[PDB]
Amino acid sequence: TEFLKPRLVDIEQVSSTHAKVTLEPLERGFGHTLGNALRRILLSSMPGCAVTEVEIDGVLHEYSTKEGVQEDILEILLNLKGLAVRVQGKDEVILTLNKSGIGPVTAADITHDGDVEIVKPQHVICHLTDENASISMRIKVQRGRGYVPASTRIHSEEDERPIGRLLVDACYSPVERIAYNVEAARVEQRTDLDKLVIEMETNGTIDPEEAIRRAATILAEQLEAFVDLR
Amino acid sequence: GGVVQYVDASRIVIKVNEDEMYPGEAGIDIYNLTKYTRSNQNTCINQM
DSSP: OOOOOOOEEEEEEOSSSEEEEEEOOOOTTHHHHHHHHHHHHHHHSOEEEEEEEEEETTOOOSSOOOTTBSSOHHHHHHHHHTOOEEEOSOSEEEEEEEEESSEEEEGGGBOOBTTEEESOTTOEEEEEOSTTOEEEEEEEEEEEESEEOHHHHTTSOSSOOOTTEEEOOEEOOOEEEEEEEEEEOOOSSOTTOEEEEEEEEEOSSSOHHHHHHHHHHHHHHHHHHHHSOO | OEEEEEEETTEEEEEEOGGGOOTTSOOEEEEEOOOSEEOTTSOEEOOO
8 A cells, every 4th residue: 555665676786796786666764664674685595606625736734835836725725715716516626726837826727617717817825936936726615604613614624625725714695785775765756765775795796786676575475474373 | 145046845055156255165055945844733844
């Protein structure tokens, strides 16, 4: 009754990681409710891909060094932890990297894959400082949601791991910052309406419209239990 | 003083300037860094 339902109107795209969305038709008081619910859901439950395992030739543990490499293994693992990868068609893929000579080792040096895209090719991984230096890695990328520490993945296991496989903590969520605002709408028939503008900060690997629709689907699926007879 | 000739995660080699050298030396300084060593309080000592 007299409830003007919201509809997605405009999606500006400020940068590769910054975007805005708008929902124009809102009744009095609904804007803040939907904004808060969507902010919480978007910050809490979006899915993504993250690096979970790394294997490096001639390396036994993370508390070691490598000849011709300026960074420790721990720093290399931390750098790999911030790698943004978009995977289509599968929930698990293994990447490979090989490089030689003197210079930085960026994400562009990863071997090309048909259904894997590297959002930021300039992400520096490590540096080589010797003419005879070389490196070879096998990087495992999975898909999930939330934050899963490796010290918890070691618990959920029933088969031993070989020496040389390095575990990495996984940060699956692709959304960093969410900010929303409520402003008056421009409907001439009803001057008591307002629109909701949501600002998103990501690392790529996610489309703003898909994220909003997934959040709405999660909220509706949660409300299905309240809707029913009990 | 001098110029960094070799740099690594656990080794630095400095090529000494000729104005600071001695007549009969190769004029290179080698610094070996301590990596992941135990301290008196069971903490980690590491140089980068």
